[PDB]
Design a binder for this molecule. Structure first.
Ligand code: NA
Ligand code: NA
Ligand code: NA
Length: 444
């Protein structure tokens, strides 16, 4: 038979600010990441997405490239600052790009998966308070409703948010991502307003009753292991698991924030944003969950401070991010969802991939054998989940091409396609050739 059914979606994924470029064209105004990347010290060597992969201009070549690989689905994000470059000011020229992009995908037999928000909040919105201002629920709802109305004939699979853990804790508490605040209370409120905005889009979506159309959300999830069997490390792992995973899984799928984290965070900051009405909106039924999976964490107790778990190095192989290559946690997380949160609901892997030190050799090829092996090991775990009864509908490799990796700039290469940024040349890596074979044979 086939390890992956004909209906299973082999995909690749990008995000608008990471690949598009054309940052000041056809009416687009600045996002918080345009601004953040221009603040000294925030992004590697002051890299920014002014040009990136120039995918805005090269999209026809990139779709042809995906068609020749046999790609069956393409996950991309839509740039809010192209669609509403000012508050309440719709930009048809911005919408026209996503119409010609998705028209090209459909005409080449690629199913579009559109992420509504992938971190490029318009600067006008942040200047009004951004995700800290509860009014953003209405601004986001107006944006999402415009996308549903204008693109409903083009796009049948919608993702409200990408990785709200990053938009909240990494952007407002740790401060690595835009807008770069460092305040736990702000990050917690932002996490709530993000989830409430997701809920508003779902409410609007259900009222539209679009034929054969599905909506979900994308979460980055890990698996946390205690470094030892001690009670100290067990509590440390519990907190780390609540911080990364349950803080978002529980309100979405149980209608309640995890109470151990509410009490834990409450010792350090306000948690008075929680109320029954908001959690009802947050926990509306979805059609699927998107899982972004990369690695696990091994943690031991720290200094009894705020979220101070010591990161243990188990001594295994890692990517250029320093992320352990541990494919078994892909299966473990999908199974955990099946047994604790999503049950029989369809799942997609909406991101999985790896950054390695890619070089174009004298033969003009990129022999990224570590990425070939990485993807092989993780797709084998996807196959094992399917054969054990898991409801996995597709798998999107991060990324189609090397791109702007946020605070790391262009220094981390995640693509199955190499980009020579000086010429914008695309070079298929060996991992892309391996993926092409996997799609064609559906065998691993
Ligand atoms: Na860009
Ligand atoms: Na810059
Ligand atoms: Na749901």
């Amino acid at each position: 038979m086939k390890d992956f059914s004909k209906d299973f979606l082999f995909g690749v994924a990008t995000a608008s600010y990471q690949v598009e470029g054309a940052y000041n064209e056809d009416g687009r105004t600045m996002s918080i990441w345009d601004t953040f990347s221009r603040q000294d010290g925030k992004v590697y060597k002051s890299h920014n997405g002014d040009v990136a992969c120039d995918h805005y201009h090269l999209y026809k070549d990139d779709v042809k490239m995906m068609k020749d690989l046999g790609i069956e689905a393409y996950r991309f994000s839509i740039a809010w600052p192209r669609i509403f470059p000012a508050k309440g000011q719709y930009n048809p020229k911005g919408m026209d790009f996503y119409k010609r992009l998705t028209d090209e995908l459909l005409k080449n037999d690629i199913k579009p998966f559109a992420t509504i928000y992938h971190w490029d909040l318009p600067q006008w919105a942040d200047d009004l308070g951004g995700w800290l201002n509860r009014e953003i629920v209405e601004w986001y709802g107006e944006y999402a409703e415009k996308l549903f109305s204008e693109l409903g004939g083009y796009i049948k699979n919608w993702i409200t948010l990408n990785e709200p853990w990053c938009s909240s804790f990494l952007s407002y508490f740790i401060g690595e991502h835009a807008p770069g605040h460092k305040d736990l209370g702000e990050a917690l409120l932002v996490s709530h307003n993000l989830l409430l905005s997701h809920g508003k889009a779902v409410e609007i979506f259900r009222g539209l009753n679009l034929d054969d159309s599905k909506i979900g959300i994308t979460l980055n999830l890990n698996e946390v292991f205690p470094a030892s069997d001690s009670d100290d490390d067990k509590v440390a792992a519990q907190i780390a698991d609540g911080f990364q995973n349950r803080w978002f899984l529980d309100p979405l799928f149980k209608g309640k924030y995890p109470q151990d984290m509410v009490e834990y965070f409450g010792k350090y900051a306000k948690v008075d944003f929680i109320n029954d009405e908001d959690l009802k909106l947050i926990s509306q039924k979805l059609d699927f969950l998107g899982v972004n999976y990369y690695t696990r964490a091994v943690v031991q107790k720290g200094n009894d401070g705020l979220l101070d778990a010591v990161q243990i190095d188990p001594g295994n192989e890692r990517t250029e991010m320093g992320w352990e290559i541990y494919p078994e946690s892909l299966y473990n997380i999908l199974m955990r969802l099946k047994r604790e949160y999503t049950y029989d609901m369809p799942l997609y892997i909406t991101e999985n991939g790896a950054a390695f030190n890619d070089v174009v050799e004298d033969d003009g090829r990129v022999h990224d054998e570590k990425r070939v092996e990485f993807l092989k090991q993780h797709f084998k775990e996807a196959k094992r989940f399917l054969n054990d009864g898991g409801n996995l509908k597709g798998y999107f490799v991060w990324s189609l091409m090397d791109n702007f990796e946020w605070a790391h700039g262009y220094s981390k290469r995640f693509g199955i396609v190499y980009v020579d940024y000086e010429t914008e040349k695309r070079i298929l890596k060996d991992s892309a050739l391996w993926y092409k074979d996997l799609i064609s044979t559906r065998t691993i």
